[PDB]
Amino acid sequence: GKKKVCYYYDGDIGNYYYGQGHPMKPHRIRMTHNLLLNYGLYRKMEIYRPHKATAEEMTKYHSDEYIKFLRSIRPDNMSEYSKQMQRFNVGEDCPVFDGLFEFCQLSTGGSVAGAVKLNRQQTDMAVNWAGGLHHAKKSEASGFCYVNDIVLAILELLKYHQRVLYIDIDIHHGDGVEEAFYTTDRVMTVSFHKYGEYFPGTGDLRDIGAGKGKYYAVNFPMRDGIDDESYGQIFKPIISKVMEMYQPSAVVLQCGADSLSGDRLGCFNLTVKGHAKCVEVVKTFNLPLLMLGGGGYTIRNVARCWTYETAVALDCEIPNELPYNDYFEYFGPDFKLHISPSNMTNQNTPEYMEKIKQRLFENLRMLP
Numbered sequence: 001g002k003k004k005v006c007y008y009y010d011g012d013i014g015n016y017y018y019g020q021g022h023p024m025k026p027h028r029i030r031m032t033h034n035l036l037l038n039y040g041l042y043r044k045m046e047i048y049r050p051h052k053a054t055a056e057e058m059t060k061y062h063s064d065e066y067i068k069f070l071r072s073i074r075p076d077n078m079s080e081y082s083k084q085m086q087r088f089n090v091g092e093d094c095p096v097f098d099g100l101f102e103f104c105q106l107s108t109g110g111s112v113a114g115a116v117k118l119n120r121q122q123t124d125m126a127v128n129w130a131g132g133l134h135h136a137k138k139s140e141a142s143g144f145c146y147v148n149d150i151v152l153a154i155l156e157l158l159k160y161h162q163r164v165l166y167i168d169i170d171i172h173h174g175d176g177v178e179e180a181f182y183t184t185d186r187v188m189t190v191s192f193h194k195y196g197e198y199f200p201g202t203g204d205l206r207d208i209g210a211g212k213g214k215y216y217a218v219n220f221p222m223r224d225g226i227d228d229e230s231y232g233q234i235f236k237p238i239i240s241k242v243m244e245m246y247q248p249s250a251v252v253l254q255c256g257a258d259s260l261s262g263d264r265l266g267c268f269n270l271t272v273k274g275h276a277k278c279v280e281v282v283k284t285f286n287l288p289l290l291m292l293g294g295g296g297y298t299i300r301n302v303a304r305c306w307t308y309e310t311a312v313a314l315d316c317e318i319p320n321e322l323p324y325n326d327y328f329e330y331f332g333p334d335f336k337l338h339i340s341p342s343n344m345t346n347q348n349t350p351e352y353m354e355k356i357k358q359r360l361f362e363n364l365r366m367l368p
């Protein structure tokens with residue numbers, strides 16, 4: 001039936017700024033919050049402000065030297081850390097900006113707090129739209145991500161759960177999460193993503209894990225222009241088979257919105273309904289669920305997507321007519337919740353989708 005939802009948000013998150021022209025806009029989290037508040041969705045869930053995650057919490061995965069660097073590096077002292085900036089991949093796609101470390105603490109805090117809430121059996125779902133920073137590595141920033149909140153949240157769930165399932169519908173490969181758990185059977189990582197001449201360059205379907213982790217990494221590589229029909233016809237079959245074979249006791253769903261139609265940096269053609277069908281599918285299994293954000297660069301559509309997916313988590317029908325809100329002008333010219341797909345060609349043929357599905361099914365038969 002209906003499920004208890006705990007939602008994590010800090011109103012300072014929208015004030016952090018990557019710099020002029022950088023496509024990551026933390027403002028999109030504020031837009032999301034304000035839109036879902038104006039739909040009345042606060043009436044049906046508990047809203048929590050995350051703690052600022054400490055260096056102790058972050059070093060459960062990241063190296064002491066990398067976290068020390070993130071704690072120290074500032075725009076005023078950049079010339080002094082020229083070597084370490086290169087070493088840790090900071091200063092270009094992952095810039096130094098004012099309050100960088102506090103920004104990492106906020107995004108991380110929501111995910112780990114959500115994990116603790118799930119472990120204590122005090123909620124069925126935990127939501128942190130500021131999280132899902134799937135590219136960050138043990139000792140390296142990558143793809144706008146500095147601290148891997150997901151890896152830290154999964155490590156928290158592993159205190160109480162033998163098997164945790166990670167599902168990733170961001171357009172990019174969940175490489176940092178996959179790498180962290182590549183040699184263990186205690187986390188199954190499942191990523192659907194664009195593959196071929198695209199960041200981060202990993203997530204071939206032949207990447208299946210290593211050692212004890214062999215067959216516990218799953219990668220569904222896709223081409224440009226996947227639509228709701230094509231996505232929906234593989235997602236439920238793959239996740240159902242994963243649930244059958246792996247039998248996890250907790251789930252982490254990264255809901256990166258850069259897989260939507262019209263994303264500034266993406267080339268997929270999903271609507272909000274198609275994207276949200278993934279949340280509906282995962283939710284039917286009735287397992288403890290941590291829902292996280294991710295990418296998304298057309299910020300009006302990010303706010304629509306995560307507002308609707310919060311409504312899906314609550315089993316709340318909300319009208320397509322957008323309510324008035326602080327960012328109402330961003331949703332023109334239509335001022336509707338749902339989006340239309342573009343006329344871009346779907347390079348993922350029905351035969352391709354079924355063929356990749358059948359090859360992943362072969363690999364899932366190797367589980368005990």
Ligand SMILES: Nc1ccc(-c2ccc(F)cc2)cc1NC(=O)C1CCOCC1
Nearest residue numbers: 132133134143144145172199265294295
């Ligand atoms: N895939 C992804 C997922 C999450 C975040 C992220 C979310 C919240 C944050 F606070 C920080 C980062 C960033 C990305 N990066 C990119 O989409 C790509 C876009 C193309 O350039 C490379 C990175």
Ligand SMILES: [Ca+2]
Nearest residue numbers: 168170172192
């Ligand atoms: Ca993905």
Ligand SMILES: [Ca+2]
Nearest residue numbers: 181184187216
């Ligand atoms: Ca694994």
Ligand SMILES: [Zn+2]
Nearest residue numbers: 170172258295
């Ligand atoms: Zn992405």
